[PDB]
PDB file of N, CA and C and ligand atoms in Angstrom:
ATOM      1  N   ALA A   1       2.664  18.720 -15.675  1.00 31.63           N
ATOM      2  CA  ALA A   1       1.986  17.512 -15.223  1.00 31.63           C
ATOM      3  C   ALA A   1       1.415  17.712 -13.833  1.00 31.63           C
ATOM      4  N   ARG A   2       0.438  16.881 -13.490  1.00 28.74           N
ATOM      5  CA  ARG A   2      -0.187  16.887 -12.173  1.00 28.74           C
ATOM      6  C   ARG A   2       0.458  15.798 -11.326  1.00 28.74           C
ATOM      7  N   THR A   3       1.156  16.214 -10.275  1.00 28.65           N
ATOM      8  CA  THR A   3       1.856  15.285  -9.401  1.00 28.65           C
ATOM      9  C   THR A   3       1.445  15.505  -7.954  1.00 28.65           C
ATOM     10  N   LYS A   4       1.583  14.448  -7.166  1.00 25.72           N
ATOM     11  CA  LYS A   4       1.249  14.503  -5.758  1.00 25.72           C
ATOM     12  C   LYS A   4       2.317  13.744  -4.987  1.00 25.72           C
ATOM     13  N   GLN A   5       2.467  14.137  -3.719  1.00 26.02           N
ATOM     14  CA  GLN A   5       3.355  13.469  -2.770  1.00 26.02           C
ATOM     15  C   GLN A   5       4.828  13.557  -3.153  1.00 26.02           C
ATOM     16  N   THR A   6       5.210  14.700  -3.706  1.00 25.63           N
ATOM     17  CA  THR A   6       6.597  14.914  -4.081  1.00 25.63           C
ATOM     18  C   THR A   6       7.415  15.359  -2.870  1.00 25.63           C
ATOM     19  N   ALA A   7       8.725  15.147  -2.954  1.00 25.32           N
ATOM     20  CA  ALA A   7       9.645  15.568  -1.901  1.00 25.32           C
ATOM     21  C   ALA A   7       9.632  17.083  -1.726  1.00 25.32           C
TER      22      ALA A   7
ATOM     23  N   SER B   1      -8.633   5.377 -11.496  1.00 22.35           N
ATOM     24  CA  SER B   1     -10.023   5.817 -11.304  1.00 22.35           C
ATOM     25  C   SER B   1     -10.988   4.652 -10.991  1.00 22.35           C
ATOM     26  N   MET B   2     -10.990   3.603 -11.819  1.00 24.07           N
ATOM     27  CA  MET B   2     -11.477   2.302 -11.365  1.00 24.07           C
ATOM     28  C   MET B   2     -10.461   1.634 -10.448  1.00 24.07           C
ATOM     29  N   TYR B   3      -9.249   2.164 -10.449  1.00 25.98           N
ATOM     30  CA  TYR B   3      -8.160   1.752  -9.581  1.00 25.98           C
ATOM     31  C   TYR B   3      -8.196   2.565  -8.285  1.00 25.98           C
ATOM     32  N   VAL B   4      -9.334   2.492  -7.594  1.00 27.10           N
ATOM     33  CA  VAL B   4      -9.545   3.222  -6.345  1.00 27.10           C
ATOM     34  C   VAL B   4     -10.267   2.314  -5.362  1.00 27.10           C
ATOM     35  N   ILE B   5      -9.831   2.348  -4.100  1.00 26.64           N
ATOM     36  CA  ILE B   5     -10.473   1.622  -3.011  1.00 26.64           C
ATOM     37  C   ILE B   5     -10.681   2.608  -1.873  1.00 26.64           C
ATOM     38  N   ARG B   6     -11.474   2.204  -0.878  1.00 23.68           N
ATOM     39  CA  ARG B   6     -11.806   3.102   0.224  1.00 23.68           C
ATOM     40  C   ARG B   6     -11.354   2.514   1.555  1.00 23.68           C
ATOM     41  N   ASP B   7     -11.087   3.397   2.529  1.00 20.02           N
ATOM     42  CA  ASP B   7     -10.777   2.962   3.887  1.00 20.02           C
ATOM     43  C   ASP B   7     -12.019   3.089   4.779  1.00 20.02           C
ATOM     44  N   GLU B   8     -11.834   2.864   6.081  1.00 20.09           N
ATOM     45  CA  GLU B   8     -12.966   2.830   7.005  1.00 20.09           C
ATOM     46  C   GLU B   8     -13.634   4.184   7.153  1.00 20.09           C
ATOM     47  N   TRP B   9     -12.918   5.262   6.837  1.00 18.81           N
ATOM     48  CA  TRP B   9     -13.409   6.626   6.954  1.00 18.81           C
ATOM     49  C   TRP B   9     -14.090   7.121   5.689  1.00 18.81           C
ATOM     50  N   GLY B  10     -14.078   6.335   4.620  1.00 17.47           N
ATOM     51  CA  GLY B  10     -14.593   6.786   3.354  1.00 17.47           C
ATOM     52  C   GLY B  10     -13.565   7.465   2.483  1.00 17.47           C
ATOM     53  N   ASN B  11     -12.310   7.510   2.921  1.00 15.56           N
ATOM     54  CA  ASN B  11     -11.254   8.079   2.100  1.00 15.56           C
ATOM     55  C   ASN B  11     -10.960   7.149   0.933  1.00 15.56           C
ATOM     56  N   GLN B  12     -10.406   7.720  -0.127  1.00 14.80           N
ATOM     57  CA  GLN B  12     -10.071   6.997  -1.343  1.00 14.80           C
ATOM     58  C   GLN B  12      -8.568   6.803  -1.427  1.00 14.80           C
ATOM     59  N   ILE B  13      -8.151   5.612  -1.836  1.00 16.08           N
ATOM     60  CA  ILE B  13      -6.741   5.314  -2.052  1.00 16.08           C
ATOM     61  C   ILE B  13      -6.609   4.845  -3.494  1.00 16.08           C
ATOM     62  N   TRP B  14      -5.757   5.510  -4.263  1.00 16.65           N
ATOM     63  CA  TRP B  14      -5.610   5.151  -5.665  1.00 16.65           C
ATOM     64  C   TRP B  14      -4.628   4.003  -5.814  1.00 16.65           C
ATOM     65  N   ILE B  15      -4.858   3.171  -6.835  1.00 20.48           N
ATOM     66  CA  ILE B  15      -4.001   2.032  -7.157  1.00 20.48           C
ATOM     67  C   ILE B  15      -3.269   2.354  -8.452  1.00 20.48           C
ATOM     68  N   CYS B  16      -1.976   2.080  -8.487  1.00 19.66           N
ATOM     69  CA  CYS B  16      -1.160   2.296  -9.689  1.00 19.66           C
ATOM     70  C   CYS B  16      -1.441   1.212 -10.727  1.00 19.66           C
ATOM     71  N   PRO B  17      -1.935   1.546 -11.919  1.00 21.19           N
ATOM     72  CA  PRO B  17      -2.153   0.490 -12.922  1.00 21.19           C
ATOM     73  C   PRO B  17      -0.862  -0.124 -13.431  1.00 21.19           C
ATOM     74  N   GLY B  18       0.287   0.529 -13.223  1.00 17.70           N
ATOM     75  CA  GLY B  18       1.537  -0.006 -13.741  1.00 17.70           C
ATOM     76  C   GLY B  18       2.055  -1.187 -12.943  1.00 17.70           C
ATOM     77  N   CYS B  19       2.004  -1.098 -11.611  1.00 19.32           N
ATOM     78  CA  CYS B  19       2.424  -2.195 -10.755  1.00 19.32           C
ATOM     79  C   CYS B  19       1.261  -2.887 -10.058  1.00 19.32           C
ATOM     80  N   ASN B  20       0.047  -2.335 -10.155  1.00 21.27           N
ATOM     81  CA  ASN B  20      -1.183  -2.856  -9.548  1.00 21.27           C
ATOM     82  C   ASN B  20      -1.166  -2.812  -8.024  1.00 21.27           C
ATOM     83  N   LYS B  21      -0.327  -1.955  -7.438  1.00 18.89           N
ATOM     84  CA  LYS B  21      -0.230  -1.785  -5.998  1.00 18.89           C
ATOM     85  C   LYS B  21      -0.662  -0.384  -5.564  1.00 18.89           C
ATOM     86  N   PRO B  22      -1.089  -0.233  -4.312  1.00 19.41           N
ATOM     87  CA  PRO B  22      -1.647   1.046  -3.851  1.00 19.41           C
ATOM     88  C   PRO B  22      -0.621   2.161  -3.752  1.00 19.41           C
ATOM     89  N   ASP B  23      -1.153   3.384  -3.734  1.00 17.56           N
ATOM     90  CA  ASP B  23      -0.464   4.543  -3.180  1.00 17.56           C
ATOM     91  C   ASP B  23       0.189   4.171  -1.856  1.00 17.56           C
ATOM     92  N   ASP B  24       1.511   4.314  -1.781  1.00 18.25           N
ATOM     93  CA  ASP B  24       2.245   4.019  -0.556  1.00 18.25           C
ATOM     94  C   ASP B  24       2.924   5.257   0.007  1.00 18.25           C
ATOM     95  N   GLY B  25       2.438   6.446  -0.354  1.00 16.60           N
ATOM     96  CA  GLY B  25       3.010   7.696   0.106  1.00 16.60           C
ATOM     97  C   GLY B  25       4.107   8.269  -0.769  1.00 16.60           C
ATOM     98  N   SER B  26       4.560   7.534  -1.779  1.00 13.87           N
ATOM     99  CA  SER B  26       5.625   8.001  -2.662  1.00 13.87           C
ATOM    100  C   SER B  26       5.031   8.839  -3.788  1.00 13.87           C
ATOM    101  N   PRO B  27       5.869   9.533  -4.565  1.00 16.19           N
ATOM    102  CA  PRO B  27       5.340  10.474  -5.566  1.00 16.19           C
ATOM    103  C   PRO B  27       4.498   9.775  -6.621  1.00 16.19           C
ATOM    104  N   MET B  28       3.445  10.461  -7.071  1.00 14.06           N
ATOM    105  CA  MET B  28       2.567   9.907  -8.090  1.00 14.06           C
ATOM    106  C   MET B  28       2.251  10.990  -9.109  1.00 14.06           C
ATOM    107  N   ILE B  29       1.813  10.547 -10.292  1.00 17.44           N
ATOM    108  CA  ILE B  29       1.474  11.432 -11.400  1.00 17.44           C
ATOM    109  C   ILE B  29       0.151  10.965 -12.003  1.00 17.44           C
ATOM    110  N   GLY B  30      -0.668  11.911 -12.457  1.00 13.79           N
ATOM    111  CA  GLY B  30      -2.025  11.624 -12.906  1.00 13.79           C
ATOM    112  C   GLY B  30      -2.182  11.838 -14.403  1.00 13.79           C
ATOM    113  N   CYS B  31      -2.863  10.903 -15.056  1.00 11.56           N
ATOM    114  CA  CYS B  31      -3.070  11.005 -16.494  1.00 11.56           C
ATOM    115  C   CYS B  31      -3.993  12.173 -16.819  1.00 11.56           C
ATOM    116  N   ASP B  32      -3.593  12.995 -17.784  1.00  9.60           N
ATOM    117  CA  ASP B  32      -4.383  14.158 -18.167  1.00  9.60           C
ATOM    118  C   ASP B  32      -5.563  13.816 -19.069  1.00  9.60           C
ATOM    119  N   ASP B  33      -5.753  12.545 -19.429  1.00  9.69           N
ATOM    120  CA  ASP B  33      -6.959  12.104 -20.122  1.00  9.69           C
ATOM    121  C   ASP B  33      -7.839  11.306 -19.164  1.00  9.69           C
ATOM    122  N   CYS B  34      -7.405  10.114 -18.738  1.00  8.66           N
ATOM    123  CA  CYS B  34      -8.257   9.215 -17.958  1.00  8.66           C
ATOM    124  C   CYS B  34      -8.175   9.421 -16.443  1.00  8.66           C
ATOM    125  N   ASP B  35      -7.183  10.159 -15.941  1.00  6.03           N
ATOM    126  CA  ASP B  35      -7.028  10.485 -14.513  1.00  6.03           C
ATOM    127  C   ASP B  35      -6.766   9.256 -13.627  1.00  6.03           C
ATOM    128  N   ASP B  36      -6.244   8.163 -14.189  1.00  4.04           N
ATOM    129  CA  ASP B  36      -5.551   7.159 -13.386  1.00  4.04           C
ATOM    130  C   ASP B  36      -4.271   7.766 -12.828  1.00  4.04           C
ATOM    131  N   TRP B  37      -3.836   7.282 -11.663  1.00  4.92           N
ATOM    132  CA  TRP B  37      -2.629   7.787 -11.020  1.00  4.92           C
ATOM    133  C   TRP B  37      -1.597   6.676 -10.869  1.00  4.92           C
ATOM    134  N   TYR B  38      -0.341   7.013 -11.143  1.00  5.55           N
ATOM    135  CA  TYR B  38       0.766   6.062 -11.207  1.00  5.55           C
ATOM    136  C   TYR B  38       1.899   6.490 -10.277  1.00  5.55           C
ATOM    137  N   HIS B  39       2.590   5.517  -9.657  1.00  4.30           N
ATOM    138  CA  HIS B  39       3.875   5.825  -9.030  1.00  4.30           C
ATOM    139  C   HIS B  39       4.862   6.294 -10.099  1.00  4.30           C
ATOM    140  N   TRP B  40       5.664   7.320  -9.786  1.00  5.04           N
ATOM    141  CA  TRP B  40       6.675   7.796 -10.739  1.00  5.04           C
ATOM    142  C   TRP B  40       7.555   6.696 -11.322  1.00  5.04           C
ATOM    143  N   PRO B  41       8.208   5.832 -10.531  1.00  5.12           N
ATOM    144  CA  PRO B  41       9.086   4.829 -11.155  1.00  5.12           C
ATOM    145  C   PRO B  41       8.352   3.883 -12.083  1.00  5.12           C
ATOM    146  N   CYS B  42       7.061   3.642 -11.853  1.00  6.37           N
ATOM    147  CA  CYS B  42       6.346   2.698 -12.703  1.00  6.37           C
ATOM    148  C   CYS B  42       6.084   3.249 -14.094  1.00  6.37           C
ATOM    149  N   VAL B  43       6.283   4.551 -14.305  1.00  5.08           N
ATOM    150  CA  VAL B  43       6.224   5.147 -15.633  1.00  5.08           C
ATOM    151  C   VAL B  43       7.551   5.817 -15.992  1.00  5.08           C
ATOM    152  N   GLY B  44       8.640   5.363 -15.376  1.00  7.46           N
ATOM    153  CA  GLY B  44       9.965   5.784 -15.799  1.00  7.46           C
ATOM    154  C   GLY B  44      10.370   7.187 -15.415  1.00  7.46           C
ATOM    155  N   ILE B  45       9.742   7.773 -14.403  1.00  7.84           N
ATOM    156  CA  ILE B  45       9.998   9.152 -14.005  1.00  7.84           C
ATOM    157  C   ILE B  45      10.874   9.165 -12.757  1.00  7.84           C
ATOM    158  N   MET B  46      11.963   9.935 -12.804  1.00  6.17           N
ATOM    159  CA  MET B  46      12.848  10.129 -11.660  1.00  6.17           C
ATOM    160  C   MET B  46      12.742  11.505 -11.028  1.00  6.17           C
ATOM    161  N   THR B  47      12.544  12.541 -11.825  1.00  6.37           N
ATOM    162  CA  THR B  47      12.350  13.891 -11.337  1.00  6.37           C
ATOM    163  C   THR B  47      11.023  14.389 -11.877  1.00  6.37           C
ATOM    164  N   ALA B  48      10.482  15.414 -11.237  1.00  6.77           N
ATOM    165  CA  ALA B  48       9.214  15.952 -11.694  1.00  6.77           C
ATOM    166  C   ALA B  48       9.331  16.364 -13.158  1.00  6.77           C
ATOM    167  N   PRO B  49       8.323  16.091 -13.977  1.00  7.17           N
ATOM    168  CA  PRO B  49       8.322  16.618 -15.336  1.00  7.17           C
ATOM    169  C   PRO B  49       8.281  18.131 -15.294  1.00  7.17           C
ATOM    170  N   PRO B  50       8.581  18.803 -16.401  1.00  7.52           N
ATOM    171  CA  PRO B  50       8.244  20.226 -16.499  1.00  7.52           C
ATOM    172  C   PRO B  50       6.788  20.426 -16.101  1.00  7.52           C
ATOM    173  N   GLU B  51       6.552  21.356 -15.174  1.00  6.98           N
ATOM    174  CA  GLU B  51       5.251  21.395 -14.507  1.00  6.98           C
ATOM    175  C   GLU B  51       4.121  21.725 -15.473  1.00  6.98           C
ATOM    176  N   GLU B  52       4.419  22.405 -16.577  1.00  7.82           N
ATOM    177  CA  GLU B  52       3.395  22.701 -17.569  1.00  7.82           C
ATOM    178  C   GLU B  52       3.193  21.582 -18.582  1.00  7.82           C
ATOM    179  N   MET B  53       4.076  20.591 -18.613  1.00  5.21           N
ATOM    180  CA  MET B  53       3.997  19.530 -19.610  1.00  5.21           C
ATOM    181  C   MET B  53       2.767  18.660 -19.381  1.00  5.21           C
ATOM    182  N   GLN B  54       2.014  18.381 -20.447  1.00  3.61           N
ATOM    183  CA  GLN B  54       0.956  17.379 -20.345  1.00  3.61           C
ATOM    184  C   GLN B  54       1.573  16.003 -20.138  1.00  3.61           C
ATOM    185  N   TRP B  55       0.922  15.175 -19.315  1.00  4.40           N
ATOM    186  CA  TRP B  55       1.339  13.788 -19.172  1.00  4.40           C
ATOM    187  C   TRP B  55       0.149  12.860 -19.391  1.00  4.40           C
ATOM    188  N   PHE B  56       0.380  11.786 -20.146  1.00  4.48           N
ATOM    189  CA  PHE B  56      -0.640  10.772 -20.388  1.00  4.48           C
ATOM    190  C   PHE B  56      -0.076   9.396 -20.065  1.00  4.48           C
ATOM    191  N   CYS B  57      -0.944   8.525 -19.553  1.00  5.95           N
ATOM    192  CA  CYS B  57      -0.547   7.187 -19.154  1.00  5.95           C
ATOM    193  C   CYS B  57      -0.322   6.325 -20.392  1.00  5.95           C
ATOM    194  N   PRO B  58       0.273   5.139 -20.232  1.00  4.27           N
ATOM    195  CA  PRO B  58       0.589   4.340 -21.426  1.00  4.27           C
ATOM    196  C   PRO B  58      -0.631   3.927 -22.219  1.00  4.27           C
ATOM    197  N   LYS B  59      -1.788   3.751 -21.570  1.00  3.68           N
ATOM    198  CA  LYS B  59      -2.991   3.391 -22.314  1.00  3.68           C
ATOM    199  C   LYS B  59      -3.485   4.559 -23.154  1.00  3.68           C
ATOM    200  N   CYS B  60      -3.484   5.762 -22.586  1.00  2.33           N
ATOM    201  CA  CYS B  60      -3.914   6.945 -23.317  1.00  2.33           C
ATOM    202  C   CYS B  60      -2.890   7.416 -24.334  1.00  2.33           C
ATOM    203  N   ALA B  61      -1.620   7.036 -24.172  1.00  4.73           N
ATOM    204  CA  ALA B  61      -0.599   7.396 -25.150  1.00  4.73           C
ATOM    205  C   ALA B  61      -0.592   6.481 -26.372  1.00  4.73           C
ATOM    206  N   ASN B  62      -1.347   5.386 -26.352  1.00  2.39           N
ATOM    207  CA  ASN B  62      -1.445   4.515 -27.517  1.00  2.39           C
ATOM    208  C   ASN B  62      -1.990   5.281 -28.716  1.00  2.39           C
ATOM    209  N   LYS B  63      -1.554   4.873 -29.904  1.00  5.98           N
ATOM    210  CA  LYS B  63      -2.078   5.416 -31.150  1.00  5.98           C
ATOM    211  C   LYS B  63      -2.504   4.306 -32.105  1.00  5.98           C
TER     212      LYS B  63
HETATM  213 MG1   MG C   1      -1.320   8.948  -0.014  1.00  6.25          MG
HETATM  214 ZN1   ZN C   2       3.231   1.511  -9.399  1.00  5.59          ZN
HETATM  215 ZN1   ZN C   3      -4.777   7.642 -19.163  1.00  7.10          ZN
END
């Protein structure tokens, strides 16, 4: 998946 | 994608269709069909999905 602003 | 607004600099801020509230700096995930972006909790996500897994939003997951 395409994710942003993860820890 | 229609859930996008701009700031004074011309930057874009995405709006989560699940809660109808803006990106607030917390983790988000993007639909692999329509490219709307959602806060993780608003689509039931606690940890990152498998990074290769396709993800689709609830509208695109309809059949
Ligand atoms: Mg942001
Ligand atoms: Zn949300
Ligand atoms: Zn979608």
